[PDB]
């Protein structure tokens, strides 16, 4: 519902076994996983998601972010700004 989407908090949470947590996401306006693809433990906690769930959920979101940006020691450089 509401425009086409890919990964939803419903399926995203279902895979982790915490679909009930959706109420906390919807209560703030989050229905898609992408909407929180870059969510922090703070934001997740702000929505009212418990620490026992925010961690699991947060973990799932992080794993999704790694797909877009991988990490490796001594491989690629970057141009830092102070």
Describe the protein's architecture and organization.
- It is found in: Nucleus.
- The chain is mainly α and 82 residues long.
- The protein has one domain (1-82): Transcription Factor, Ets-1 (DNA polymerase, domain 1, Orthogonal Bundle).
- It is 45% helix and 0% strand.
- The chain contains four helices and no strands.
- The longest helix is centred in the C-terminal third of the chain and has 18 residues, at 51-68.
In short:
It is classed as apoptosis. With 82 residues, this protein is mainly α.
CATH topology: DNA polymerase, domain 1
**What proportion strand?**
under 5%
How many domains? The number is: 1
Cα(first) to Cα(last) distance is 44 Å
Number of strands: 0
Main sheet attributes: strand count, strand direction, barrel closure:
none
CATH top level? Mainly Alpha
């Amino acid at each position: 519902g509401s425009y086409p989407t890919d990964c939803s908090i419903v399926s995203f949470l279902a895979r982790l076994g915490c679909s009930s947590c959706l109420d906390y996401f919807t209560t703030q306006g989050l229905t898609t996983i992408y909407q929180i693809e870059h969510y922090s433990m703070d934001d997740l906690a702000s929505l009212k998601i418990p620490e026992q769930f925010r961690h699991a959920i947060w973990k799932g979101i992080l794993d999704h972010r790694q797909l877009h940006e991988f990490s490796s020691p001594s491989h690629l450089l970057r141009t830092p700004s102070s």
